[PDB]
Write a structure and sequence with these properties.
about 650 residues, mainly beta, 2 domains, about 45% strand, Gem-associated protein 5, rna binding protein, gemin5, SMN complex, WD40 domain
């Protein structure tokens, strides 16, 4: 197939944290990285599929990237500069995705930056204390300009003059300054009554300037007269601008709710765009494809990236994104394409991966959830029935086909929900949930307002035992649905059979709390393969257990196992998830806090493939139910990557 990537939402409230270069390359700041996107006939997508692809990630900054600008100089269209909350300004080469050179000249938090449209190596960056810094990376020269003690919001270099730079400030003041004359204020533009959000120059010599402010107005100044000549009032808010070179008469602005407007300059005549943004738009980026098509990309607080066809004024494609950790990934057993994602922004994403019109066809389910979704589980036989657990202990049951809010279980866990599972009830299918406090309880999906029955009562009454039952940290049903497994904080793995939960085996092999348990599917070539059980804990070592010998025994007295059938070693951090491949015999994928996902032949104990695209701790893995080479994985880097095992260059976890 083709690898995909669900990137983190672009950063909010940034005057210029995204840019594009002609031909089809768009970059946007998101968390501590910059994500590059090929756009147009350069992506090489199938017909019907939107012509874009994520291919790049700028890794390096230690905290939030607050600015990003591309070099528009010919021959240098592959160079870009970023500004971070760590006070660095790094120059990148996008072909190599490495840092050319960086500085740390700013002593106060950086606001924005911009690449000189007329100087091949000049970078101008401002900070919150009003300090402006001109930087040339060829000879590593820096001029320390200080204009006014006002917080800088936006900064834009003149396209036509090599030494003029316009600056917008939080108090509504706009000043124009000469870089050669020691930062001499050339003009002081007073008119705006709130924060300046965007400064746009006229792309034609002879000059003119445009500014958009939180006072809901757009002002157009004359750098000759040093005052405004026309004022446009829109009909919270961020007001960014775009003055297209092809249409010098027109001017495109953002508006309330992320609406976009195209201001004609014959009168106040505007045209409304349109599949529309639902929250305020921060940046507008234009790019021209090789196909001579003029597009405009928009980032917004609604966590989407939209590409607009300037000719039709309608939305070509929409790129969703994530705002939280990808806690949970689950594929529906009936809808092969449905990929449910549990995100730390309380919102459940269902990714129809089978959509042929759209590669990123994702649907959001926010209503009803107000906390991070740490567990998901599709119903085995029911299309659209999806259960979810939250970080504060709430258990739900969505209906993705309906439009109603989810059904929240009346019984909440005291801690975060670790995992969910569908199995047979004990006192057609019932819902099982494991809390962080150690309690596993069973929910009736039909009578859902009734209390949840704590299954530890059952374990104590069937298995003659008054023991203080351990802290349960896992639950995983056998494929047949006749055997249940529990993981515990000590590291034990109790095995249960029958409907009364007769404990018949305790697996004391791990030495920290269990974090994942997965049974092998029964579709394989051999039958005994169904009895294999993978498990991971806070130890970096993964164990496989064959339980055929004990389940066919079904002893009256439980047994204890201390030798594992297979031992997978290589990880260097705790294991978060393991999943058996449905397409192979004994093929296991594992995620770990080492930042890697690892495929191995669990039968021969052979490491096959190691995925290192993530820049954080992986929290979930799911095998693609339709492509035997494809795996989806999500991490605490706000990403979900879809990768192929054959295209990875490393076969083993790093050491």
């Amino acid at each position: 197939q083709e690898p995909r990537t669900l990137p983190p939402s672009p950063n909010w409230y940034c005057a210029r944290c995204s840019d594009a270069v002609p031909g089809g390359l768009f970059g946007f700041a998101a968390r501590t990285s910059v994500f590059l996107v090929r756009v147009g006939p350069g992506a090489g997508e199938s017909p019907g599929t939107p012509p874009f692809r994520v291919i790049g990630e700028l890794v390096g900054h230690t905290e939030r990237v607050s600015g990003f600008t591309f070099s528009h100089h010919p021959g240098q269209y592959n160079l870009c500069a970023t500004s971070s909350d760590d006070g660095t300004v790094k120059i990148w080469d996008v072909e190599t995705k490495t840092v050319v050179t960086e500085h740390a000249l700013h002593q106060h938090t950086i606001s924005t930056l911009h690449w000189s449209p007329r100087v091949k190596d000049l970078i101008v960056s401002g900070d919150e204390k009003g300090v402006v810094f001109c930087y040339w990376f060829n000879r590593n020269d820096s001029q320390h300009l200080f204009i006014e003690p006002r917080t800088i919001f936006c900064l834009t270099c003149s396209p036509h003059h090599e030494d003029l730079v316009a600056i917008g400030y939080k108090d509504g003041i706009v000043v124009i300054i000469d870089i050669s004359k020691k930062g001499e204020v050339i003009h002081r533009l007073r008119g705006h009554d709130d924060e300046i959000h965007s400064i746009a120059w006229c792309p034609l010599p002879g000059c003119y300037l445009a500014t958009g402010s939180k006072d809901q107005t757009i002002r157009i100044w004359s750098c000759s007269r040093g005052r405004g000549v026309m004022i446009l009032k829109l009909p919270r808010l961020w007001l960014t601008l775009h003055w297209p070179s092809n249409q010098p008469t027109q001017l495109v602005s953002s508006c309330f709710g992320g609406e976009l407007l195209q201001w004609d300059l014959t009168q106040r005549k505007y045209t409304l765009f349109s599949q529309n943004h639902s929250r305020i738009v921060f940046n507008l980026c234009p790019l021209q494809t090789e196909d001579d098509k003029q597009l405009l990309l928009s980032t917004s607080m609604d966590r989407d990236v939209k590409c607009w066809d300037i000719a039709t004024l309608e939305c070509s494609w929409t790129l969703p994104s994530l705002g939280g950790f990808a806690y949970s990934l689950a594929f529906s057993s009936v809808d092969i394409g449905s990929l449910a994602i549990g995100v730390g922004d309380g919102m459940i994403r269902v990714w129809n991966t089978l959509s042929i019109k759209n590669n990123y066809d994702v649907k959001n389910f926010w209503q009803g959830v107000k906390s991070k979704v740490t567990a998901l589980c599709w119903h085995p036989t029911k299309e659209g029935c999806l259960a979810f657990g939250t970080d504060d202990g709430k258990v739900g049951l969505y209906d993705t086909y309906s439009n109603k809010p989810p059904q929240i279980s009346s019984t909440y866990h005291k801690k975060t929900v670790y995992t969910l599972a569908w199995g047979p009830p004990v006192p057609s299918l019932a819902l099982y949930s494991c809390g962080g406090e150690g309690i596993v309880l069973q929910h009736n999906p039909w009578k859902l307002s009734g209390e949840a029955f704590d299954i530890n009562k059952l374990i104590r009454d069937t298995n003659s035992i008054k023991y203080k039952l351990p802290v349960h940290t896992e639950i995983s049903w056998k494929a047949d649905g006749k055997i249940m497994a529990l993981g515990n904080e000590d590291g034990s793995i109790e095995i249960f059979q029958i409907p009364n939960l007769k404990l018949i085996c305790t697996i004391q092999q791990h030495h920290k709390l269990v974090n994942t348990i997965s049974w092998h599917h029964e579709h394989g070539s051999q039958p005994e393969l169904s009895y294999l059980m993978a498990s991971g804990s806070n130890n970096a070592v993964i164990y496989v257990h064959n339980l055929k010998t004990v389940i066919e025994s079904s002893p009256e007295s439980p047994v204890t196992i201390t030798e594992p059938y297979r031992t997978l070693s290589g990880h260097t951090a705790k294991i978060t998830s393991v999943a058996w491949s449905p397409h192979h015999d004994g093929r296991l994928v594992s995620a770990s806090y080492d930042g890697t996902a690892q495929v191995w032949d669990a039968l021969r104990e052979e490491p096959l493939c190691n995925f290192r695209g993530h820049r954080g701790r992986l929290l979930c893995v799911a095998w693609s139910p339709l492509d035997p080479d494809c795996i989806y994985s999500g991490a605490d880097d706000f990403c979900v990557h879809k990768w192929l095992t054959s295209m990875q260059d490393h076969s083993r976890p790093p050491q």
